[PDB]
Structure 1
Amino acid sequence: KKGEWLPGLASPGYLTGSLPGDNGFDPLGLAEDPENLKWFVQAELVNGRWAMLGVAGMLLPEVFTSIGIINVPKWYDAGKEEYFASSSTLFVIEFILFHYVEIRRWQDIKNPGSVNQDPIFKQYSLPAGEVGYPGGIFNPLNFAPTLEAKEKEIANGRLAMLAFLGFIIQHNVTGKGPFDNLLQHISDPWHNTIVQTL
Protein backbone atom coordinates (compact mmCIF):
# COMPACT_ATOMS: atom_id res chain seq x y z
CA LYS A 1 0.00 0.00 0.00
CA LYS A 2 1.87 3.04 -1.34
CA GLY A 3 -1.20 5.16 -2.13
CA GLU A 4 -3.38 5.07 -5.24
CA TRP A 5 -4.33 8.08 -7.32
CA LEU A 6 -7.04 5.86 -8.78
CA PRO A 7 -8.15 3.39 -6.06
CA GLY A 8 -9.26 0.54 -8.32
CA LEU A 9 -6.40 0.98 -10.79
CA ALA A 10 -3.15 -0.89 -10.28
CA SER A 11 0.25 0.75 -10.24
CA PRO A 12 2.60 0.69 -13.23
CA GLY A 13 5.25 -1.91 -12.56
CA TYR A 14 8.09 0.57 -13.03
CA LEU A 15 6.88 2.69 -10.07
CA THR A 16 8.55 0.63 -7.36
CA GLY A 17 7.34 2.65 -4.38
CA SER A 18 10.88 3.78 -3.50
CA LEU A 19 10.33 7.24 -4.95
CA PRO A 20 8.78 9.93 -2.74
CA GLY A 21 5.39 11.04 -4.00
CA ASP A 22 4.82 7.70 -5.75
CA ASN A 23 1.03 7.35 -5.98
CA GLY A 24 1.26 5.10 -9.04
CA PHE A 25 0.47 7.91 -11.47
CA ASP A 26 1.91 7.70 -15.00
CA PRO A 27 -1.09 6.95 -17.26
CA LEU A 28 0.72 8.00 -20.46
CA GLY A 29 3.79 5.88 -19.66
CA LEU A 30 6.28 8.75 -19.74
CA ALA A 31 8.44 7.22 -16.99
CA GLU A 32 8.39 3.62 -18.23
CA ASP A 33 12.05 3.98 -19.25
CA PRO A 34 14.16 4.46 -16.10
CA GLU A 35 16.36 7.26 -17.48
CA ASN A 36 13.18 9.16 -18.29
CA LEU A 37 12.09 8.51 -14.71
CA LYS A 38 15.30 9.99 -13.26
CA TRP A 39 15.16 13.04 -15.52
CA PHE A 40 11.50 13.63 -14.71
CA VAL A 41 12.19 13.29 -10.98
CA GLN A 42 14.65 16.17 -11.23
CA ALA A 43 12.21 18.04 -13.49
CA GLU A 44 9.36 17.66 -11.01
CA LEU A 45 11.66 18.80 -8.21
CA VAL A 46 12.72 22.01 -9.97
CA ASN A 47 9.33 22.88 -11.48
CA GLY A 48 7.76 22.24 -8.07
CA ARG A 49 10.25 24.38 -6.15
CA TRP A 50 10.13 27.31 -8.58
CA ALA A 51 6.34 26.98 -8.53
CA MET A 52 6.26 27.19 -4.72
CA LEU A 53 8.37 30.36 -4.68
CA GLY A 54 6.44 31.87 -7.58
CA VAL A 55 2.99 31.18 -6.14
CA ALA A 56 4.16 32.71 -2.86
CA GLY A 57 5.60 35.86 -4.48
CA MET A 58 2.44 36.24 -6.58
CA LEU A 59 -0.15 35.75 -3.84
CA LEU A 60 1.34 37.12 -0.60
CA PRO A 61 2.45 40.59 -1.82
CA GLU A 62 -1.09 40.98 -3.15
CA VAL A 63 -2.86 40.09 0.10
CA PHE A 64 -0.43 42.33 2.00
CA THR A 65 -1.10 45.19 -0.42
CA SER A 66 -4.88 44.74 -0.27
CA ILE A 67 -4.84 44.63 3.53
CA GLY A 68 -2.85 47.88 3.34
CA ILE A 69 0.22 46.82 5.34
CA ILE A 70 2.36 47.52 2.25
CA ASN A 71 1.82 48.70 -1.33
CA VAL A 72 3.18 46.32 -3.98
CA PRO A 73 2.14 46.11 -7.66
CA LYS A 74 0.25 43.08 -8.89
CA TRP A 75 2.43 40.13 -9.88
CA TYR A 76 1.54 40.68 -13.54
CA ASP A 77 1.91 44.47 -13.21
CA ALA A 78 5.26 44.10 -11.42
CA GLY A 79 7.06 43.78 -14.75
CA LYS A 80 6.09 47.22 -16.04
CA GLU A 81 7.39 49.03 -12.95
CA GLU A 82 10.49 51.22 -12.87
CA TYR A 83 13.64 49.73 -11.34
CA PHE A 84 17.22 50.80 -10.71
CA ALA A 85 18.39 48.95 -13.84
CA SER A 86 17.14 48.56 -17.38
CA SER A 87 15.09 45.38 -17.62
CA SER A 88 17.43 44.28 -20.41
CA THR A 89 20.38 44.57 -18.00
CA LEU A 90 18.40 42.65 -15.37
CA PHE A 91 17.80 39.94 -17.97
CA VAL A 92 21.47 39.63 -18.96
CA ILE A 93 22.46 39.34 -15.28
CA GLU A 94 19.82 36.68 -14.65
CA PHE A 95 20.82 34.77 -17.78
CA ILE A 96 24.55 34.69 -17.03
CA LEU A 97 24.05 33.56 -13.43
CA PHE A 98 21.47 30.90 -14.28
CA HIS A 99 23.69 29.76 -17.15
CA TYR A 100 26.43 29.02 -14.63
CA VAL A 101 24.36 27.42 -11.87
CA GLU A 102 22.03 25.33 -14.03
CA ILE A 103 24.97 23.83 -15.91
CA ARG A 104 26.64 22.84 -12.64
CA ARG A 105 23.40 21.18 -11.48
CA TRP A 106 23.19 19.45 -14.87
CA GLN A 107 26.74 18.16 -14.44
CA ASP A 108 25.47 16.59 -11.23
CA ILE A 109 22.51 15.01 -13.04
CA LYS A 110 24.75 13.38 -15.65
CA ASN A 111 27.74 12.52 -13.43
CA PRO A 112 26.64 12.63 -9.77
CA GLY A 113 29.19 13.95 -7.30
CA SER A 114 31.28 15.61 -10.02
CA VAL A 115 30.56 19.27 -9.18
CA ASN A 116 30.36 18.93 -5.39
CA GLN A 117 33.38 21.15 -4.64
CA ASP A 118 34.04 24.85 -5.05
CA PRO A 119 36.23 25.24 -8.18
CA ILE A 120 37.72 28.41 -6.67
CA PHE A 121 38.27 27.30 -3.07
CA LYS A 122 39.50 23.71 -3.16
CA GLN A 123 38.27 23.22 0.41
CA TYR A 124 34.60 23.83 1.27
CA SER A 125 33.27 21.00 -0.88
CA LEU A 126 29.87 19.44 -0.60
CA PRO A 127 29.18 16.14 1.16
CA ALA A 128 28.06 13.28 -1.06
CA GLY A 129 24.28 13.47 -1.29
CA GLU A 130 21.66 12.25 -3.74
CA VAL A 131 20.91 13.75 -7.15
CA GLY A 132 18.55 16.65 -6.49
CA TYR A 133 19.32 17.12 -2.77
CA PRO A 134 22.63 18.96 -2.35
CA GLY A 135 23.90 19.01 1.21
CA GLY A 136 26.55 21.21 2.77
CA ILE A 137 26.05 24.94 2.33
CA PHE A 138 22.65 24.28 0.73
CA ASN A 139 21.35 22.92 4.08
CA PRO A 140 22.68 25.31 6.75
CA LEU A 141 20.11 24.33 9.37
CA ASN A 142 21.06 20.70 8.64
CA PHE A 143 17.55 19.28 8.54
CA ALA A 144 17.12 15.54 8.06
CA PRO A 145 16.32 14.90 4.30
CA THR A 146 14.15 11.85 4.93
CA LEU A 147 10.92 10.54 3.50
CA GLU A 148 7.86 12.56 4.55
CA ALA A 149 10.24 15.51 4.32
CA LYS A 150 10.84 14.84 0.62
CA GLU A 151 7.21 13.72 0.31
CA LYS A 152 6.07 17.07 1.75
CA GLU A 153 8.44 18.92 -0.60
CA ILE A 154 6.88 17.08 -3.55
CA ALA A 155 3.32 17.53 -2.27
CA ASN A 156 3.67 21.29 -1.79
CA GLY A 157 5.48 21.43 -5.13
CA ARG A 158 2.60 19.74 -6.95
CA LEU A 159 -0.03 21.85 -5.20
CA ALA A 160 2.02 24.94 -6.10
CA MET A 161 2.39 23.95 -9.77
CA LEU A 162 -1.38 23.50 -9.98
CA ALA A 163 -1.69 26.79 -8.08
CA PHE A 164 0.46 28.65 -10.62
CA LEU A 165 -1.57 27.22 -13.50
CA GLY A 166 -4.69 28.49 -11.75
CA PHE A 167 -3.12 31.92 -11.29
CA ILE A 168 -2.22 32.46 -14.94
CA ILE A 169 -5.48 31.10 -16.37
CA GLN A 170 -7.56 32.91 -13.74
CA HIS A 171 -5.83 36.24 -14.38
CA ASN A 172 -6.34 35.66 -18.11
CA VAL A 173 -10.11 35.31 -17.82
CA THR A 174 -10.82 37.65 -14.86
CA GLY A 175 -8.27 40.44 -15.41
CA LYS A 176 -7.52 40.64 -11.68
CA GLY A 177 -5.28 39.13 -9.00
CA PRO A 178 -5.64 35.70 -7.38
CA PHE A 179 -6.53 37.06 -3.93
CA ASP A 180 -8.94 39.45 -5.67
CA ASN A 181 -10.51 36.34 -7.20
CA LEU A 182 -10.76 34.66 -3.79
CA LEU A 183 -12.46 37.72 -2.29
CA GLN A 184 -14.87 37.94 -5.23
CA HIS A 185 -15.74 34.26 -4.79
CA ILE A 186 -16.16 34.33 -1.00
CA SER A 187 -18.47 37.33 -1.51
CA ASP A 188 -21.26 35.42 -3.31
CA PRO A 189 -19.91 31.98 -4.25
CA TRP A 190 -23.01 30.56 -5.96
CA HIS A 191 -23.14 33.60 -8.26
CA ASN A 192 -19.37 34.25 -8.54
CA THR A 193 -17.89 31.20 -10.27
CA ILE A 194 -16.04 30.30 -13.48
CA VAL A 195 -19.57 29.71 -14.78
CA GLN A 196 -20.41 33.38 -14.29
CA THR A 197 -16.83 34.42 -15.10
CA LEU A 198 -17.25 33.24 -18.70
Structure 2
Amino acid sequence: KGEWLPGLASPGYLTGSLPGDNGFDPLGLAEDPENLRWFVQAELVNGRAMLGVAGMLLPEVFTSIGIINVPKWYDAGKEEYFASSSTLFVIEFILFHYVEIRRWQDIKNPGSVNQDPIFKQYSLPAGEVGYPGGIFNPLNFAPTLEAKEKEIANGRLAMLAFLGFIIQHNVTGKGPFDNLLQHISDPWHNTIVQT
Protein backbone atom coordinates (compact mmCIF):
# COMPACT_ATOMS: atom_id res chain seq x y z
CA LYS A 1 0.00 0.00 0.00
CA GLY A 2 1.55 3.25 1.20
CA GLU A 3 5.11 3.94 2.32
CA TRP A 4 6.22 5.27 5.70
CA LEU A 5 9.02 7.22 4.02
CA PRO A 6 9.08 8.38 0.36
CA GLY A 7 12.69 7.36 -0.17
CA LEU A 8 14.44 4.36 1.41
CA ALA A 9 11.66 2.19 -0.10
CA SER A 10 9.73 -0.84 1.14
CA PRO A 11 11.45 -4.20 1.69
CA GLY A 12 10.66 -7.27 -0.40
CA TYR A 13 9.07 -8.96 2.61
CA LEU A 14 6.50 -6.18 2.75
CA THR A 15 4.60 -7.19 -0.37
CA GLY A 16 1.33 -5.50 0.49
CA SER A 17 -0.54 -8.78 0.72
CA LEU A 18 -0.80 -8.23 4.47
CA PRO A 19 -3.33 -5.63 5.66
CA GLY A 20 -1.63 -2.55 7.11
CA ASP A 21 1.50 -2.92 4.99
CA ASN A 22 3.56 0.28 4.74
CA GLY A 23 7.11 -0.99 4.25
CA PHE A 24 8.18 -0.20 7.74
CA ASP A 25 10.75 -2.61 9.02
CA PRO A 26 13.93 -0.61 9.29
CA LEU A 27 15.63 -2.96 11.69
CA GLY A 28 14.71 -6.17 9.96
CA LEU A 29 13.09 -8.35 12.58
CA ALA A 30 10.39 -9.67 10.25
CA GLU A 31 12.53 -10.73 7.27
CA ASP A 32 12.25 -14.45 7.58
CA PRO A 33 8.80 -15.44 6.43
CA GLU A 34 8.28 -17.71 9.40
CA ASN A 35 9.22 -14.66 11.38
CA LEU A 36 6.44 -12.59 9.89
CA ARG A 37 3.61 -15.06 10.24
CA TRP A 38 4.38 -14.96 13.97
CA PHE A 39 4.76 -11.18 14.26
CA VAL A 40 1.57 -10.75 12.24
CA GLN A 41 -0.26 -12.72 14.93
CA ALA A 42 1.45 -10.82 17.74
CA GLU A 43 0.50 -7.45 16.24
CA LEU A 44 -3.18 -8.40 16.07
CA VAL A 45 -3.36 -9.83 19.59
CA ASN A 46 -1.44 -6.95 21.09
CA GLY A 47 -3.37 -4.50 19.01
CA ARG A 48 -6.69 -5.93 19.95
CA ALA A 49 -4.75 -2.22 23.55
CA MET A 50 -7.92 -1.19 21.89
CA LEU A 51 -10.07 -3.24 24.19
CA GLY A 52 -8.14 -2.07 27.18
CA VAL A 53 -7.10 1.46 26.41
CA ALA A 54 -10.72 2.17 25.80
CA GLY A 55 -11.37 0.23 28.93
CA MET A 56 -9.21 2.54 31.00
CA LEU A 57 -10.16 5.69 29.27
CA LEU A 58 -13.89 5.71 28.73
CA PRO A 59 -14.99 4.72 32.27
CA GLU A 60 -12.67 7.47 33.52
CA VAL A 61 -14.66 10.00 31.48
CA PHE A 62 -18.00 8.45 32.40
CA THR A 63 -17.01 9.43 35.92
CA SER A 64 -16.68 12.98 34.61
CA ILE A 65 -19.75 14.66 36.06
CA GLY A 66 -20.67 12.07 38.66
CA ILE A 67 -22.64 9.50 36.68
CA ILE A 68 -20.66 6.62 38.19
CA ASN A 69 -18.52 6.43 41.32
CA VAL A 70 -15.87 3.91 40.30
CA PRO A 71 -12.18 4.11 41.30
CA LYS A 72 -9.47 5.05 38.79
CA TRP A 73 -7.92 2.44 36.52
CA TYR A 74 -4.79 2.55 38.55
CA ASP A 75 -6.72 2.22 41.81
CA ALA A 76 -8.89 -0.78 40.91
CA GLY A 77 -6.77 -3.38 42.69
CA LYS A 78 -9.13 -3.82 45.64
CA GLU A 79 -11.70 -4.48 46.67
CA GLU A 80 -13.12 -4.85 43.15
CA TYR A 81 -14.14 -8.41 44.01
CA PHE A 82 -16.93 -10.38 45.66
CA ALA A 83 -14.37 -13.15 46.00
CA SER A 84 -11.15 -11.21 46.76
CA SER A 85 -8.29 -10.69 44.29
CA SER A 86 -6.21 -13.85 44.61
CA THR A 87 -9.26 -15.97 43.75
CA LEU A 88 -9.65 -14.22 40.44
CA PHE A 89 -6.10 -14.55 39.14
CA VAL A 90 -6.20 -18.35 39.28
CA ILE A 91 -9.58 -18.43 37.53
CA GLU A 92 -8.28 -15.95 34.98
CA PHE A 93 -5.07 -17.95 34.57
CA ILE A 94 -6.32 -21.55 34.43
CA LEU A 95 -8.94 -20.86 31.78
CA PHE A 96 -7.06 -18.29 29.78
CA HIS A 97 -4.52 -21.03 29.81
CA TYR A 98 -6.94 -23.15 27.95
CA VAL A 99 -7.91 -20.58 25.41
CA GLU A 100 -4.41 -19.49 24.67
CA ILE A 101 -2.98 -22.90 23.79
CA ARG A 102 -5.93 -23.71 21.54
CA ARG A 103 -5.33 -20.44 19.85
CA TRP A 104 -1.74 -21.52 19.63
CA GLN A 105 -2.41 -24.57 17.52
CA ASP A 106 -4.17 -22.56 14.85
CA ILE A 107 -0.92 -20.71 14.28
CA LYS A 108 0.86 -23.96 13.43
CA ASN A 109 -2.04 -25.96 12.00
CA PRO A 110 -5.66 -24.74 11.55
CA GLY A 111 -6.86 -26.37 13.38
CA SER A 112 -9.08 -26.58 16.38
CA VAL A 113 -12.05 -24.99 14.72
CA ASN A 114 -14.34 -27.75 16.01
CA GLN A 115 -16.38 -27.89 19.27
CA ASP A 116 -15.25 -30.35 21.84
CA PRO A 117 -17.27 -31.74 24.65
CA ILE A 118 -20.32 -31.11 22.65
CA PHE A 119 -22.15 -34.38 22.02
CA LYS A 120 -23.84 -33.63 18.73
CA GLN A 121 -23.09 -30.24 17.21
CA TYR A 122 -21.38 -27.92 14.79
CA SER A 123 -17.87 -26.51 14.71
CA LEU A 124 -16.29 -23.32 13.57
CA PRO A 125 -16.10 -23.13 9.82
CA ALA A 126 -13.25 -20.85 8.74
CA GLY A 127 -9.92 -20.11 7.11
CA GLU A 128 -7.06 -17.71 8.04
CA VAL A 129 -4.95 -17.82 11.22
CA GLY A 130 -5.45 -14.37 12.61
CA TYR A 131 -9.18 -14.11 12.06
CA PRO A 132 -11.70 -16.84 12.86
CA GLY A 133 -15.32 -16.31 11.79
CA GLY A 134 -18.10 -18.10 13.65
CA ILE A 135 -19.72 -16.74 16.80
CA PHE A 136 -16.54 -14.81 16.88
CA ASN A 137 -18.46 -12.99 14.19
CA PRO A 138 -22.10 -13.72 14.95
CA LEU A 139 -23.33 -10.92 12.80
CA ASN A 140 -21.31 -12.54 10.05
CA PHE A 141 -19.71 -9.33 8.99
CA ALA A 142 -17.48 -8.97 5.92
CA PRO A 143 -14.06 -10.48 6.46
CA THR A 144 -12.88 -7.83 4.00
CA LEU A 145 -10.04 -6.74 3.24
CA GLU A 146 -9.86 -3.02 4.06
CA ALA A 147 -11.26 -3.41 7.52
CA LYS A 148 -8.50 -5.91 8.05
CA GLU A 149 -6.39 -2.82 7.51
CA LYS A 150 -8.79 -0.81 9.56
CA GLU A 151 -8.50 -3.29 12.34
CA ILE A 152 -4.78 -2.98 12.45
CA ALA A 153 -4.35 0.76 12.07
CA ASN A 154 -6.70 1.39 14.97
CA GLY A 155 -4.92 -1.15 17.08
CA ARG A 156 -1.57 0.40 16.34
CA LEU A 157 -2.74 3.79 17.52
CA ALA A 158 -4.20 2.26 20.61
CA MET A 159 -0.86 0.72 21.33
CA LEU A 160 0.94 4.03 21.11
CA ALA A 161 -2.01 5.28 23.12
CA PHE A 162 -1.30 2.83 25.88
CA LEU A 163 2.35 3.76 25.90
CA GLY A 164 1.11 7.32 26.34
CA PHE A 165 -1.18 6.45 29.19
CA ILE A 166 1.34 4.68 31.38
CA ILE A 167 4.15 7.13 30.81
CA GLN A 168 2.03 10.20 31.29
CA HIS A 169 0.62 8.77 34.48
CA ASN A 170 4.09 8.81 35.92
CA VAL A 171 5.06 12.44 36.43
CA THR A 172 1.47 13.68 35.95
CA GLY A 173 0.87 11.69 39.09
CA LYS A 174 -2.79 11.35 38.24
CA GLY A 175 -5.41 10.04 35.87
CA PRO A 176 -4.73 9.93 32.19
CA PHE A 177 -7.88 12.03 31.88
CA ASP A 178 -7.37 14.53 34.64
CA ASN A 179 -4.07 14.71 32.69
CA LEU A 180 -5.99 15.24 29.60
CA LEU A 181 -7.98 17.93 31.22
CA GLN A 182 -5.12 19.61 33.07
CA HIS A 183 -3.69 20.27 29.61
CA ILE A 184 -6.96 21.89 28.56
CA SER A 185 -6.74 24.44 31.39
CA ASP A 186 -5.75 26.80 28.57
CA PRO A 187 -2.68 25.03 27.24
CA TRP A 188 0.28 26.67 25.54
CA HIS A 189 1.78 26.43 29.05
CA ASN A 190 0.42 22.99 29.90
CA THR A 191 2.91 20.86 28.11
CA ILE A 192 5.03 17.86 28.89
CA VAL A 193 7.78 20.45 28.79
CA GLN A 194 6.66 21.28 32.30
CA THR A 195 7.83 17.77 33.08
Q: Cα gap change, 1:30/1:67 in structure 2, threshold over 3 Å: closer, same or farther? A: same
> Which stretch shifts more, 28-37 or 79-88?
79-88
Q: Which runs of 5+ in 1 are unaligned?
A: none
Mapped to 2, the partners of 1:48 and 1:176 lie a distance apart of 25
Distance 2:112 2:51 in 1: 28
- Bigger helix fraction: 1
State the Cα RMSD in Å: 1.3
CA contact 1:48–1:161 (8 Å) conserved in 2:
yes
Larger mean CA deviation between 101-110 and 5-14 belongs to: 5-14
Shift of 1:132: 1.2
- Report if the CA contact (8 A) 2:44-2:152 is conserved: yes
Alignment CA distance shift 1:27-1:121 (3 Å): farther
Superimposed CA distance per residue, residues 138-168 of structure 1 (whole angstroms, 9 cap, x where no aligned partner): 1101000111111111011001111111001
Q: Deviations over 1:166-196 (max 9, x none)?
A: 0011111211111111111111211111111
Give the ranges of 4+ consecutive aligned residues of structure 1 lying more than 2 Å apart after TM superposition: 113-123
Q: Tell me the distance in 1 between the aligned counterparts of 2:80 and 2:16.
A: 49
Contact 1:118 1:124 in 2 (8 A): no
Report if the CA contact (8 A) 1:107-1:115 is conserved: no
Query: Conserved in 2, the CA contact under 8 Å of 1:12 and 1:24?
Result: yes
Query: Is the alpha carbon distance of 1:130 and 1:119 closer, same or farther for their aligned partners in structure 2, counting shifts above 3 Å?
Result: farther
Counterpart Cα distance in 2 of 1:148 and 1:82:
39
Shift in Å at residue 84 of structure 1? 0.3
CA distance in 2, matches of 1:149, 1:179: 29
**Distance in 1 separating the partners of 2:100 and 2:53:** 21
Asked if structure 2 preserves the Cα contact closer than 8 Å seen for 1:116 and 1:128, the reply is no
CA offset at residue 22 of structure 1?
0.3
The more displaced of 13-22 and 62-71 is 62-71
TM-score normalised by L of structure 1: 0.94
SS of the residue aligned with 2:166?
A: helix
| Pair 1:81–1:23, CA change in 2 (3 A) | same
For 1:1-198, list aligned pairs within 5 A: 2-49=1-48, 51-121=49-119, 123-197=121-195
C-alpha deviation, 1:9, in angstroms: 2.2
Task: Assess if the C-alpha contact under 8 Å between 1:64 and 1:71 holds in 2.
Answer: no
Can you list the C-alpha shifts for 1:58-103, whole angstroms capped at 9, x where unaligned? 0011111122111111100011334201211100000011100000
The 10-residue stretch of structure 1 (158-167 or 182-191) with the greater mean CA deviation from structure 2: 182-191
Residue 114 of structure 2 contacts residue 124 of structure 2 at CA under 8 Å; is this kept in 1? yes
Instruction: Tell me the CA shift for residue 113 of structure 1.
Output: 2.6
Secondary structure, counterpart of 1:168 in structure 2: helix
